[PDB]
Amino acid sequence: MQEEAKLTKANNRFGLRLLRALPSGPEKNVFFSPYSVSTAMGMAFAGARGQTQQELSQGLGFSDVDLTDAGVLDAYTHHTERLKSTPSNSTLDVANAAAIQRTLALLNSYESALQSSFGAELHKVDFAGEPQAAVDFVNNWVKRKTHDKIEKLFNEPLDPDTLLVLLNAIYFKGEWNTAFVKEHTEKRQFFNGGVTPVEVDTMRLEARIKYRFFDDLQVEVVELPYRGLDYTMAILLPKENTGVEGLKQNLTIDRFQNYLSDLRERKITVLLPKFKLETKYSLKAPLQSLGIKQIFESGADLSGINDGSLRVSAVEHKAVVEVNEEGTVAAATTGVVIVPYPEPVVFRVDHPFLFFIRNTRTDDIFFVGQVNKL
Template identity: 30%
Template sequence: MRVVLSLCLVVSVLQGAVQCDHHHQNHNGNHKHQDHHEKEHKEHQHPAMDKRACHKIAGANTEFAFNLYKQIAESGSSDNVFFSPLSISTAMSMLSLGARSTTKDQIVEGLGLNITNTTDKEIHEGFHHLIHMLNDANSDLQLNTGNVLFISEDLKMLPTFLEDVKNYYESNAFTTDFKNEEEAKKQINDHVEKKTNGKIVDLLQSVDQSALMVLVNFIVFKGKWEKVFDPKLTKEDTFFVDENTTVRVPMMEQEGSIHTWKDREMPCTVVRLNYAGNASAFFILPDEGKMKQVEEGLSAATLQKWRHTDRERRCSLHIPKFSISATCDLKKVLLKVGMIEVFSDIADLSRITGQRNLKASKAVHKAMLSIDEQGTEAAGATAVEIKPRFIPRPVILNRPFLFLLYGDITESLLFMGRINNPTQT
């Protein structure tokens, strides 16, 4: 069984109330911006790669993830909810490099980070270390994340900002002609599609002529389970979307020793499936009518409890085979978590240009999740499993459930969502 996850976040930075200084800068292709990127700050290069660097921000990232989820889910929509909290926090933290004063404080506090106990350097080194670990070529996980800036030919940027986003966030930069809206949109969408291996297409529906910068973060994940699902056992079954709606879905099945348990404090059943390569997926099936109660109980402490619960029982597990995508107008959600100034005319993003002439105008988030039966090449040992004559009551995910994907080494929540209807693409 393989899980494929792709994500892209975009923040567009537009001209604010103050006119930009567009003088004395002639960009020739990508050269001006990329020259800055070649200048490495030695003090920033892979800072000791101590696990504590990313672990220092891990708790805040998890709380931010659940806070963001609750803001998205509270709309009451019956649509699927799916996003990468890590992608969003990475992009906003990168943007905070260009912010000052209360604009910066709102971004950092909105991310759940304690500005009293955590320095700016610790925050950015934490994300730097996290990106480095996620992109580890030696890991069994196929995971790739990156950041890109698309910058207007008219935007005069401070070299220190470009150097910092390169050194901390490994970001690339490209010059973009936003006055040619269609060409700018195509340049950005084509880049995102290429970097996500064709999983995220047509991210931007439009680009504003007055845009000066578009910031993109992408993350792609391919995971293979330690214990595979036999495609021969997949059969069509009923999924109960709500009291009045049912759909038919291919339901995968696995019998044997499964990490699954009934939570004693929250009305739900938890299933944990491990990936080869230090990552775990949690499927949370609320009791009938208890979805809202379970959602309200989501927290970093809850996740920690589930991570350290090591209960296995022999059962028959049934999980839908599906592929979904979800798009979110992230600006509305970020406003709710307190990031207000950065989207207003009083935004202070003066660390980008040296002037208070910019504001963020748009934040778009698109993610995709696909689950199928493709297993690992080294799955022979786990595929040969003695089945008991009697299988206890099965665990069947045939109604809306929550999905969490957790990176064990980085202690980071990579993806999360609510699957209301697995047939909704």
């Protein structure tokens, strides 16, 4: 398979692995862009060497798909290019950049790689002398690229020893192929945390929708496509009200793709809450739990960046989504901070569930959520 296809496979596997490691609870929703996180970590990977590079190759999923270090940069070039030129009814914008200390010398090779593989602009800032101005700059980049959906990634200035912040932003807007019928939206029961009944605005449609119940993990699956059917929201609904955490833990990328392959269009009724999520994560700890460790530590080898001693102090992520009768808008951003050292069917989404906004042509998974509380 193509390098870009290997990369999609690595990104997707990493995506579910990260999903499993994110903080979750009956009162705490989960939402993030694994594609955003992977892309930002790819930019750091471009500058990693030695054991640090090998550990990242492993962690980001490259090794398991036989995607070589050089192949990663190739694959990213093709992702970046196809993202620009792809004809769709839906909007998907991905942007990358690097905020660099004004007096930091980057290796020419790294600067070139950021441009060629990621289309990443460089922007000089004064991390050391002007922490407020530097973080204002970074946040205003995030705001423009997420189409104003995320105002700030960093709520406080960065530590003045910061030398580089690698940034990714993503924005998605789609309209449903089959809109929910707004006249039929009503307050309906939803089991918050799988156990606490509340009333929430709940949307209704009845149409031929890709659907299957799978006995293996006792899960109903649908895909709700956007216009043109090239993007979809896949929804995984546990049989049991309290089934979501177990579902998340049991899911693998092969099982997920196999579920998708087995869906068939069927006339069903879908009852789906309208909802908005807004989340934020410090990803260092979850990334460490996935075995990505050396990059965070003294002794890290990021010498492909500036031929010096650099490590990652933090990886921060923010994400937002709005789901309603017309469609979906989602955005996310990631910042890597671097320092020196047939019978009727009713698909009733009335309890916690997982969803995935994906491209059906490429298999790219752009957004993933777990809805626990509404």
